Design a protein around this motif. Structure first.
Motif: not given
Ligand code: F43
Ligand code: F43
Ligand SMILES: C[C@@H](OP(=O)(O)O)[C@H](NC(=O)CCCCCCS)C(=O)O
Ligand SMILES: O=S(=O)(O)CCS
Ligand SMILES: O=S(=O)(O)CCS
Ligand SMILES: [Mg+2]
Ligand SMILES: [Mg+2]
Ligand SMILES: [Mg+2]
Ligand SMILES: [Mg+2]
Ligand SMILES: [Mg+2]
Ligand SMILES: [Mg+2]
Ligand SMILES: [Mg+2]
Ligand SMILES: [Mg+2]
Ligand SMILES: [Zn+2]
Lengths: 246, 548, 442, 548, 55
Positions: C140-157
């Motif tokens: 839901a955070i990746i989709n809210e901000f359209d976080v890129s494939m390159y940065d999304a693994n920081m949301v998971k961490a």
């Protein structure tokens, strides 16, 4: 309450230290200032430090148990929890480690007592600890040659006595004065020098040590000859054994 | 004759052992001690070379206001200060644990079935000898198949090898005897016949990996290392492709289906893999010790050599370093293997049981527990009361509790022939001791003691187990000194009185019947004395690869 | 009914609620409120949206003091909490009308999440709660901000930490009262690995509620471990009723009689007199000036002695307003009562033994800590089969501020979220009401 | 200029490195080698002394039908046969691991708060210095409170001590300097300001327990040993009762609430406690290596020194012993730290990116991954096709896959400034190499390689993690050689190109900036060469307590 | 073949109640069938569930 089985003097002495109705014999007089100095937590004329604010300042939520259970005075004030610790010689000191923890939780409120072979400790709120400590130091809980107030370096419960009848102390906190026959406390319980020593009175003589002790030994009263106390220990063993099985 | 501890008390102190009074404060502190004086000098040299203060006798409180005592290693005439019995300062104690940690028993029964049934090749004593010559090249870390391999220096790994054993005498005698643990040479006749009946036609390897590798790594390296080099030697000796589907069956058999670890792995709060001390059950520890096959005429000597083995490993190395560290727990363990004290108390109890019942003839019930454990607990405690030098020697209550109860529990099991009533006698001893002297051990000593009586005969999930199957991970035993090595002695006691060849695993018993081991498991207290004297030669050192 | 026994049930103010309730109506196997609490514990997660946002903005992910320079991401997660939580909820639920709950707290800084009970009925265990919650919030955070494939693994961490390099969710910004299945000391232990500070935080320091929640969790684990099967079941149920549920108002009445001036010893005297008055014990033998008591019902003696042990804790640690002495009360209440009576102490010596080791490991260099960081799965305090840890929870509820590792230090995220749930905060109410409801089905 | 690997190739072979043919079979097998001849001789001496056959060159196949090569340790002029780089035969490699395993970082921040709040006592630079003198006596195993303690021999434990660091210069100034890791002395000015800002006013201990204890026991001993002796020194230096309720808060803080372990515990199939190699994340391994604070104007040297640290620890000791054993995996690791081969390829990639983009300037996206990782993969593969002697040197496909992909991955991360796109470049290099030569590594080499592209940017539970947080327990990476140390290098690469003082944990970076370590972490490849030459002096030996 | 009742799982965290409740019910039924004594019953426990909880 019954407290302890047995028909020896040792058994009766164990019951008397537990029974809050039994008046502990007072053997010596110590001033309030000298109890504070022996404890070593604060200087005379230093206010009680706090670990939290006074209970009145806290306004806590409705709880039937808090309301039913009166806090000790140091708990109402927010005092630090501090300690006093004693070591008891196996050569017939009057109190001994389990006798202390058992008696402390019959006699005293709000008490954290711990038993070990070479030390026994109580921790409670500071101003209440000073009131209890006077009674532990002035009464037959304490003998100044066969017991020691020691917050560290406790070795001596199981050692041979010196030529004055004093228990060993690595830090020599209690010194026997041959000129008076009395013991002085020269250091506080953690081993720092006192400005002025505290008189702890005369050691109990051998006859009175035998009258008052709570250890069983072949050269005093042996536990194996207190056949009613051994019966109850053996009964507890067998009933715990059968309970755990079925 | 004198009580067995008298000579040691006369060596420690100038007074007779019965004398109640002495002199303190006049011995010069640490300067009374040869060993403390060596340490003060060495601390000044270490701090000067590295530029950081280290050992200093004036930090904290001043040792030696009383006599710093020598200790007799029991069964020997060797007297040493207790620092020489710290596991850091005793190479024999380090090697004893390295020899256990780096051993694993690995069957050849599934392996030989894979060769016959899946590869269609024959197994005979000759093919087994050819495989054993190959695996004793490969096991220390040398190559058998690939080009341009780089290998371990043979002299750094000289302690690693593979032997075998089988209960079939005629097959044992056909394999080259440089590789065979000979059951009939190493065990008296009746115990040899019991062990060979247990093994039958089974063939088992005893694999020892290098001590330098076990020190660099951990216990859970042992069965992997063993399996890699078994796997290479099965390829080379039976002419497999070097890496085909059947190669995986030899890996699964050596690493899981026919491996016996010395210890099982531990739960996460005390996480450790296999072959660490906490996984070694008490019955295996008694079987590792080899006193049973040499001193079988004397069940007291066999039981108390197992107590020495377990008190050093479980309290000094395991609880005192793996589970804590620092100065640690030397004298919590030395109380069970010095001054002939536990020996005096346990010979008393054996003689008591011989007179009243006869060994192994008493009823296996609570009446025997109550009789024998109470009698022996009062004998031991009377000795500390009658001899003030004995009480000043075993100065900590935990030390006395473990010694008195070990004599009481071993003597109950000599009467019943059953380790579970022995264990009930150990707990009753602690309860009587605690009421006699109004003290028992350190603050946390009797956690297991108070749970103890109810859990002896419980049958519940994490409560109920025969004593031989318990160990340092049995829940109530997982934390505290002064119990685990004594329980290994109580597990040995009924089996030594019965004349049983083993306590819990006959393969573990045979696996340590081997004079190619670096430590001599037949005389554990002798070896502890040799290490204290700085006379033991360990394996694993790096002198060959470092400056001269 | 398998057992004939009945008990009277009270509220946390000492008033009768329901009389003559069959003992099995309080069994975790039968009582539907115990079922709802246990399933609630399994499925509830606290989400720290502020923590996630701050970990991302500073790149401080993966555990204490860790940081990855150059990975910082500045996302307005708390400012868009409503949209993020709704999007997570649509992935967490199974259907539109199930029992999924996603609720914002603290102006969007925290979320209470209750994963739908149905995901558990087709699961082996309880890890779906943190793992379904964490992925639905990461997505839901990746989709809210359209976080890129390159940065999304920081949301998971930032959400789940260093897992799976670490076995635990090391550095995670979500929390549960349960801990991971690999940390169990034995199979069946999971309802025991619940920090005492988290029970005291959930119950808002109400002493009787903290003791009841702790006892329901401990004794329900006894069933899962098989300890409460066959010969032992009645012992366990009477322990639950008398030590944890204030059955017959026994605990409450002992505390009322000893609260002003009493000690552990005065509570023991009253409990022995009450056992005698009720016929639970009787004098078997006279020695010299000493009565040896016997019982024809060891399970009921054990239960009365257990109620006294709880009352003794409340009197002793309540008087000091300092929890540390619970280790001492657990030891010497049991040691004194056996030499007072000739009968075995609570749990046949196992409370006394747990208390010996607990005292050592709360006053020594070797391990443990303050009372609040223990639990029924801790090696020091697992040994008694449910009769020790509830007393530690009552003692920490009564502590006025003596602990460094207090519930405010260790359990603040758990407090904010899990005290919202009525059956976690006030379990005594719900389990009583339920027992009255099924009383005629036993 | 010559490629960087030309000198080493000219040392190995008589032919120029471009030559396509040679002659084999005429070198006398093992007799061509000084080291194999040492091993043959030692095997015969070992086998006679112990009465069991051991190393024998006639078992299995005959090594040395081709040249047994010397290796140049990269960045040195030291050339050794590969057996001198086996961890068993190299005391510098063993010591590198012992210095990591025996270190823990332990805060004083909670401890000072318990002192001021619960005890009501003051903490100052003075009381800290007094505490540090006390803990530097206690930590190696010496007593500060009880009578009749027995202690470790100071000279056996001379490598154990405690230092502190803080971002607050004016405390770091006020504490005795023997005990302080001084950030301003150890780091260049820009990195020192970053590190001091991260630590702030926190004060942290770096505790090293004795190597002899780590070797006897395991990594999970370190934080327990540390906490026992911090606990004794807090009781002695701050005047506590020696064992009161507050003592438990110091234990919980030192063991759990303010500790940093070097490695976290492992799952049961590979059960191990803390401070074992599999628990050390790749970001921590790059911060343990100290090349970043010495060689910061050369990001390739910093990244390749981290690859050497990690290839040796994770492939030789961890995968090649803890997780397998035997002859093991020396040359799967040596490919990444010998003959200047990875260095030539990575300096080509760095030049390519500095000229095209500028370091750290390229877009952080798949276009940059496709550009740089494909260009550097083709450069490295072209070298093996142009120089036959280079292909015969790195003879195993797995060695070539790890070296070419390390250079491609590091170069990608020097372009993007982000380790995740460097990891995607590592997997693309594998897929291009596999198609170019119709082979890659050993049978199991690309399990993680084929999961690799899809898991670089995943966010799922056991898939998604930044590379700096991954380690040997990330599921895909848990089994196979030729990846883990190279991933540590990719983790370092973007941080060395950016000039960052650390990769993942600034406390770990500061904790190894210490010349009192036995191994020199600023020059890992120099140390490997010193160990190979038998010139390194390790700690931990038992010579002082064994006969002459 | 033993199938432990479903209701024991809807009040459990996980699935170990199946071996644990089965093992103890068979250990107690065997001890009750033969009147195995307190001294011997721990061998029934070992034969049903093995070396747990040492392992
Ligand atoms: C600080 C503690 C509390 C704690 O958590 N551990 C301590 C101290 C710790 C330190 C003491 C080292 C030092 O002096 O610096 C070590 C060696 C553990 C370590 N960190 O290496 C230890 N105890 Ni202790 N500890 C021991 C013992 C004991 C006995 C000592 C009684 C006496 O009269 O001398 C008592 C417990 C009891 O009363 O039963 C005891 C207490 C204590 N034990 C009191 C300090 C007592 C005092 O102030 O003097 N130990 C023993 O009873 C014998 C074995 C001995 C251990 C060393 C060894 O085994 O060689 C040592 C084991
Ligand atoms: C028996 C296996 C199957 C298996 O499970 N492991 C083996 C053997 C094993 C043994 C070989 C020791 C000995 O000779 O007794 C050891 C050293 C591990 C151990 N037990 O100590 C090892 N491999 Ni292998 N193994 C290696 C390698 C390799 C390369 C060698 C290719 C070549 O052209 O020479 C190939 C895989 C591939 O083709 O990619 C390989 C195969 C094989 N590997 C084939 C044997 C190949 C043969 O018959 O010659 N390894 C390497 O590519 C380089 C590193 C080298 C390892 C030793 C070190 O790192 O120094 C060794 C690592
Ligand atoms: C209790 C537990 O410590 P924690 O509470 O988990 O820190 C445990 N230590 C121990 O059991 C210490 C045992 C050795 C020292 C005391 C011996 S009596 C451990 O480190 O795993
Ligand atoms: O004093 S304590 O019992 O906590 C420790 C004994 S080593
Ligand atoms: O041949 S294999 O890939 O199985 C092993 C290489 S070491
Ligand atoms: Mg007065
Ligand atoms: Mg023949
Ligand atoms: Mg007699
Ligand atoms: Mg020999
Ligand atoms: Mg009353
Ligand atoms: Mg009468
Ligand atoms: Mg030519
Ligand atoms: Mg050097
Ligand atoms: Zn090791």
């Amino acid at each position: 309450a019954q407290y302890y089985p047995g028909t020896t003097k040792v058994a009766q002495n164990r019951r008397n230290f537990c029974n809050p109705e039994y008046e502990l014999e007072k053997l010596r007089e110590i001033s309030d200032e000298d109890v504070v100095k022996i404890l070593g937590h604060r200087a005379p004329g230093e206010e009680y430090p706090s670990v939290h604010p006074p209970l009145e300042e806290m306004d806590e939520p409705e709880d039937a148990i808090r309301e039913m259970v009166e806090p000790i005075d140091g708990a109402k004030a927010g005092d630090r929890v501090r300690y006093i610790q004693f070591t008891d010689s196996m050569y017939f000191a009057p109190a001994q480690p389990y006798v202390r923890s058992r008696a402390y939780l019959c006699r005293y409120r709000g008490a954290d007592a711990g038993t070990l072979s070479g030390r026994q400790i109580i921790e409670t709120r500071e101003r209440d600890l000073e009131k209890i400590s006077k009674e532990l130091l002035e009464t037959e809980f304490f003998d100044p040659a066969r017991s020691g107030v020691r917050g560290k370096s406790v070795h001596g419960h199981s050692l041979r006595l010196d030529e004055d009848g004093m228990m060993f102390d690595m830090l020599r906190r209690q010194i026997y004065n041959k000129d008076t026959g009395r013991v002085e406390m020269v250091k506080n319980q953690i081993g720092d020098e006192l400005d002025e020593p505290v008189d702890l009175g005369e050691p109990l003589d051998e006859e009175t040590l035998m009258e008052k002790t709570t250890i069983y030994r072949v050269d005093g009263e042996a536990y194996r000859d207190d056949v009613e106390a051994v019966e109850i220990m053996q009964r507890i063993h067998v009933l715990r054994s059968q309970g755990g099985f079925n | 004759a004198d009580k067995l501890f008298i000579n040691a008390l006369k060596k420690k102190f100038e007074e007779s052992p019965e004398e109640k009074k002495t002199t303190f404060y006049t011995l010069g502190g640490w300067k009374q001690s040869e060993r403390k004086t060596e340490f003060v000098n060495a601390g000044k040299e270490v701090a000067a070379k590295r530029g950081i203060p280290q050992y200093n006798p004036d930090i904290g409180t001043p040792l030696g206001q009383r006599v710093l005592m020598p200790y007799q290693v029991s069964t020997t005439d060797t007297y040493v200060e207790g620092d020489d019995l710290h596991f850091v300062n005793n190479a024999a104690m380090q090697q004893m644990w390295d020899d256990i940690r780096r051993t694993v028993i690995v069957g050849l029964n599934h392996a030989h079935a894979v060769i016959e049934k899946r590869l269609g090749k024959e197994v005979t004593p000759e093919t087994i000898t050819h495989y054993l010559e190959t695996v004793n090249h490969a096991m220390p870390g040398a190559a058998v198949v690939q080009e341009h391999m780089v290998e371990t220096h043979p002299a750094l790994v000289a302690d690693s090898y593979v032997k075998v054993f089988t209960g079939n005498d005629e097959i044992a005698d056909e394999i080259d005897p440089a590789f065979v643990i000979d059951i009939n040479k190493q065990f008296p006749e009746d115990q040899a016949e019991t062990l060979k009946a247990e093994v039958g036609d089974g063939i088992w390897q005893v694999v020892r990996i290098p001590t330098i590798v076990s020190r660099t790594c951990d216990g859970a390296t042992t069965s992997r290392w063993s399996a890699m080099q078994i796997g290479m030697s099965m390829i080379s000796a039976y002419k497999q492709a070097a890496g085909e589907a059947a190669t995986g069956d030899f890996a699964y058999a050596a690493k899981h289906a026919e491996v016996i670890h010395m210890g099982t792995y531990l739960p996460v709060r005390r996480a450790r893999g296999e072959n660490e001390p906490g996984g070694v059950p008490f019955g295996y520890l008694a079987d590792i010790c080899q006193s049973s096959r040499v001193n079988y005429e004397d069940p007291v000597r066999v039981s108390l050599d197992v107590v020495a083995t377990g008190a050093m490993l479980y309290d000094q190395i395991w609880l005192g370093s793996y589970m804590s560290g620092g100065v640690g727990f030397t004298q919590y363990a030395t109380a069970a293997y010095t001054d002939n004290i536990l020996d005096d108390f346990t010979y008393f109890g054996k003689e008591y049981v011989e007179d009243k019942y006869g060994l192994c003839e008493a009823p296996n019930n609570m009446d025997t527990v109550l009789d024998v454990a109470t009698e022996v607990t009062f004998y031991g405690l009377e000795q500390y009361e009658e001899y003030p030098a004995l009480l000043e020697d075993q100065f900590g209550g935990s030390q006395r509790a473990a010694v008195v109860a070990a004599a009481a529990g071993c003597s109950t099991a000599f009467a019943t022939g059953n380790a579970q009533t022995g264990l009930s006698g150990w707990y009753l001893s602690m309860y009587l001791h605690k009421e006699q002297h109004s003290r028992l051990g350190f603050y946390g000593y009797d956690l297991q003691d108070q749970c103890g009586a109810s859990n002896v005969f419980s049958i519940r999930g994490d409560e109920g187990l025969p004593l031989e199957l318990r160990g340092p991970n049995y829940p109530n035993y997982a934390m505290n000194v002064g119990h685990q090595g004594e329980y290994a002695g109580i597990s040995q006691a009924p089996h030594a009185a019965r004349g049983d060849a083993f306590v819990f695993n006959p393969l573990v018993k045979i696996a340590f019947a081997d004079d190619n081991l670096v430590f001599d498991f037949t005389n554990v207290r002798g070896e502890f004395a040799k290490g204290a004297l700085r006379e033991f030669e360990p394996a694993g050192e790096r002198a060959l690869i470092t400056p001269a | 009914a398998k057992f004939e026994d009945k008990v009277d049930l009270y509220d946390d103010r000492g008033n009768l609620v329901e009389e003559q309730v069959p003992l099995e109506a309080l069994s975790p196997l039968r009582n539907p409120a115990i079922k709802s609490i246990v399933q609630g514990i399994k499925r509830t997660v606290a989400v720290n949206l502020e923590g996630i946002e701050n970990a991302l903005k500073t790149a401080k992910v993966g555990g204490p003091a860790c940081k990855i320079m150059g990975r910082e991401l500045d996302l307005d997660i708390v400012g868009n909490a409503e949209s993020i939580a709704a999007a997570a909820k649509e992935m967490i639920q199974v259907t539109e009308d199930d029992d999924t709950n996603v609720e914002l707290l603290g102006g969007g800084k925290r979320a209470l999440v209750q994963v739908p009970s149905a995901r558990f009925d087709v699961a082996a265990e309880y890890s779906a709660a943190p793992l379904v919650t964490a992925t639905a919030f990461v997505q839901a955070i990746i989709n809210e901000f359209d976080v890129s494939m390159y940065d999304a693994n920081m949301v998971k961490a930032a959400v789940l930490g260093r897992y799976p390099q670490s076995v635990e969710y090391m550095g995670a910004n979500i929390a549960t009262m349960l801990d991971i299945p690999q940390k169990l000391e034995g199979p069946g232990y999971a309802l025991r690995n619940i920090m005492v500070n988290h029970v005291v935080a959930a119950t808002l320091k109400n002493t009787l509620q903290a003791a009841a929640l702790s006892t329901i969790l401990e004794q329900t684990a006894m069933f899962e471990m098989g300890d409460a099967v066959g010969a032992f079941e009645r012992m366990h149920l009477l322990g639950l009723a008398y030590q944890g549920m204030n059955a017959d108002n026994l605990v409450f009445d002992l505390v009322k009689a000893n609260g002003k001036e009493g000690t552990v010893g005065s509570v023991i005297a009253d409990l022995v007199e009450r056992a005698l008055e009720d016929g639970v014990i009787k004098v078997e033998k006279e020695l010299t000036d000493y009565k040896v008591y016997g019982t024809d019902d060891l399970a009921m003696w054990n239960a009365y002695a257990a109620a006294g042990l709880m009352a003794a804790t409340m009197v002793n640690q309540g008087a000091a307003r300092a929890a540390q002495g619970v280790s001492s009360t657990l030891l010497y209440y049991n040691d004194l009562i056996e030499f007072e009576t000739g009968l075995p102490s609570v749990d046949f010596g196992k409370v006394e033994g747990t208390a010996v080791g607990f005292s050592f490991f709360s006053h020594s260099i070797y391990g443990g800590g303050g009372p609040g960081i223990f639990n029924g799965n801790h090696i020091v305090t697992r040994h008694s089969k449910g009769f020790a840890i509830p007393c530690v929870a009552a003692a920490m509820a009564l502590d006025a501020g003596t602990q460094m590792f207090s519930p405010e230090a260790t359990s603040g995220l758990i407090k904010e979220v899990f005290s919202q749930v009525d059956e976690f905060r006030e379990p005594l109410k719900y389990v009583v009401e339920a027992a009255a409801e099924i009383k005629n089905e036993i």
